[PDB]
């Protein structure tokens, strides 16, 4: 009685592929257009906000989560897989670093920690592997601003701009052409709305874009108005009005 399932559910096929990773990727291709840009004077990430219903809050909805204070992530794939994964990433990041080295994990180090979760899950049976791909966009004061891709298997590679979801390749073409480093964060926000207007047609607004930047400070993001002791967050998610203001700014 009870489970006995310990046989791996991810297995090799005659070609050298892994059935479960192939499947999972189809889901990711069909998922919501997300991109990431390093502006060099920041990092701007944008993703599609969506609504389920007009009578539905989209405050609760999670399309951009802060993994650690200076770092945000966005994705294309399977929403439920994303939500749990964010949780295990937040937990280990807090317990194992935030009073051990006395600060957040470096971006590359955090990409490896995610990578490991996904790989445990691919090796081991009882459970199928995560079906997701992430774009982890970040700042760490020992590597600047970074952009990574995290694949479903947990393969990762460095990027300085990319897009995943539906309609990626052409989105990368517009981004490649418009930005080539040394660019204001504001300007990268403008370029990003332009790339996505061409990418999404039928109805387009800044109330269907959810935009976050890592690329600012306020005293409010030290979390106190007194005498500094540390630097604190640089994650800031914008409200819908601010985004419409940048849509009005040519």
């Amino acid at each position: 009685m009870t489970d006995r399932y310990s046989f791996s559910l991810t297995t090799f096929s005659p070609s050298g592929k892994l059935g479960q990773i192939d499947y999972a990727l189809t889901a990711v291709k069909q998922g919501v257009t997300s991109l990431g840009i390093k502006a060099t004077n920041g990092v701007v990430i944008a993703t599609e906000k969506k609504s389920s219903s007009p009578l539905a809050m989209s405050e609760t909805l999670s399309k951009v989560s802060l993994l650690t204070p200076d770092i945000g992530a966005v994705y294309s794939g399977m929403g439920p897989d994303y939500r749990v994964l964010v949780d295990k990433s937040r937990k280990v990041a807090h317990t194992s670093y935030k009073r051990i080295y006395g600060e957040y994990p470096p971006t590359k180090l955090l990409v490896s920690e995610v990578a490991k979760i996904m790989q445990e899950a691919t090796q081991s049976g009882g459970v199928r592997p995560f079906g997701v791909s992430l774009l982890i966009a970040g700042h760490d004061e020992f590597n600047g601003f970074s952009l990574y891709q995290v694949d479903p298997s947990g393969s990762y590679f460095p990027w300085k701009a990319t897009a995943i979801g539906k309609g990626s390749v052409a989105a990368k073409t517009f981004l490649e052409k418009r930005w080539n480093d040394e660019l204001e964060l504001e300007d990268a926000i403008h370029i990003a709305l332009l790339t996505l207007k061409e990418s999404v047609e039928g109805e387009f607004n800044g109330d269907t874009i959810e935009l976050a930047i890592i690329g600012d400070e306020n005293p409010d993001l030290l979390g106190y108005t007194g005498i500094p002791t540390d630097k604190g967050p640089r994650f800031r998610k914008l409200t819908s009005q601010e985004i419409n203001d940048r849509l009005e700014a040519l």
Binding site: R4, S6, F7
Partner: protein
């Protein structure tokens, strides 16, 4: 739980998994042991085709199990490490506990025993290796030669040969040995061992590795230089019997 089945009966009263373990050994390299009545010779192939191997850190086929005992094999190296490690531990376990140097029979029982377990027990498969175990018992000058299969069965043999073209090397050896008059001198027993193993390696005289075991820890590996000399000689012998 992964204690459930992974090795099942045949309807013929074999086991599928043991029949498939023996195949990996055959595709493999060849190892042989031929007995005198003063030594036990072990020949092992090193047929380096390619010249981009560096061969002082290319794995050997000869392990100490004990200072007076050797193990040679034919089969997957990966599996063979796992067996080789458990067998070294067992020699030291006896040494510690009985205050006594190790006897060959018990070690063979041990080597047999781990392989035997993994066919019988669930969620494990047997090793991909057949072995030859040889050495000398303490205070003893008569040779010992054992064969174990990954079935877990075990036997003694006056001489035995394994891996690729086992048939060919048994068949030859059978004409050149009698139990009533086996060889007394190292040189002629080694000559015979090099000659059998020449006939299956193809070209080889640096690709053949001989190690000759005399009583109680006199274990000496003959070199290329020496082997090239016996091969010359064999090319002189084959036009004295023409």
């Amino acid at each position: 739980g992964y204690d459930r089945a992974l090795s099942i009966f045949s309807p013929d009263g074999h086991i599928f998994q043991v029949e498939y373990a023996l195949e990996a050994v055959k595709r493999g390299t060849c190892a042989v042991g031929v007995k005198g009545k003063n030594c036990v010779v072990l020949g092992c192939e090193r047929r380096s085709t390619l010249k981009l191997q560096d061969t002082r850190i290319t794995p050997s086929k000869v392990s100490k199990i004990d200072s007076h005992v050797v193990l040679s094999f034919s089969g997957l190296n990966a599996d063979s490490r796992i067996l080789i490690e458990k067998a070294r531990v067992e020699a030291q376990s006896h040494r510690l506990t009985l205050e006594d140097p190790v006897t060959v029979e018990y070690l063979t029982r041990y080597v047999a025993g781990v392989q035997q377990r993994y066919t019988q027990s669930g969620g494990v498969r047997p090793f991909g290796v057949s072995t030859l175990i040889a050495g000398f018992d303490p205070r003893d000058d008569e040779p010992k030669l054992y064969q174990t299969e990954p079935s877990g069965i075990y036997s003694s043999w006056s001489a035995q040969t394994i891996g690729r073209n086992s048939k060919t090397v048994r068949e030859f050896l059978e004409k050149n040995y009698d139990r009533k008059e086996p060889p007394a001198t190292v040189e002629e027993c080694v000559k015979l061992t090099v000659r059998s193993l020449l006939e299956v390696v193809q070209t080889g005289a640096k690709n053949i590795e001989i190690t000759v075991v005399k009583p109680d820890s006199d274990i000496v590996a003959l070199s290329s230089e020496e082997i090239n000399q016996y091969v010359t000689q064999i090319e002189q012998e084959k036009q004295e019997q023409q």
